[PDB]
């Protein structure tokens, strides 16, 4: 959910 995350 954070915009910098790469994987769910």
């Amino acid at each position, epitope marked *: *959910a*954070h*915009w*910098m*995350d*790469q*994987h769910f």
Partner: antibody
Amino acid sequence: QIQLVQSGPELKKPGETVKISCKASGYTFTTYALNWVKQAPGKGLKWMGWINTYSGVPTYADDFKGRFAFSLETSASTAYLQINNLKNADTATYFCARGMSGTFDYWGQGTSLTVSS
Amino acid sequence: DVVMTQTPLSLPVSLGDQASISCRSSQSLVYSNGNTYLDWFLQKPGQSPKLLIYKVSNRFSGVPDRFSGSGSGTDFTLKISRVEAEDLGVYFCSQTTHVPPTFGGGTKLEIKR
């Protein structure tokens, strides 16, 4: 045992190009974002943008659109920062930092860049 | 872009004393998922930032028990319960709630005389 190791100090002239590396160890490189941060002598930290280490897609902050390029060597768990058409105002320490869950949790040691004619 | 304002700019302490540093943001740092992406870092001269506290109040692994964080919304505090020599340096807050991430200007923890 997580570590980000950056390339060594650079001295360059205005108009030249420089490429700085950031090699990651101790985790799966493609799982987490890598961020670039500028620290000009006695100035506040400035976020430059990030690269998605899985897709390779870069995102540039508004002051770093134009002459800055983020790239990867995923095979070597290494990220690169290239600065083209160097200006005097590019003089600074550049850091890479891992982004995990919205936090810059591990930083590189920094790469000093000095720009002078 | 969100402005992060730290107070004071310089904090004199005696070794063994408590220290408190403030960080205020120009906007709420609550994200749409309910998290507050406010972190605290120590930077020593010629070295990189080291994470102390993440998401307001979570102590990062390896960080001594004497560091703690508190606060909510736009108003945040880092406390050191008993200052040691290794703790002198510059403390910075960061937010990543809003793009672009931004940083406070830093608070220097120094020796009182």
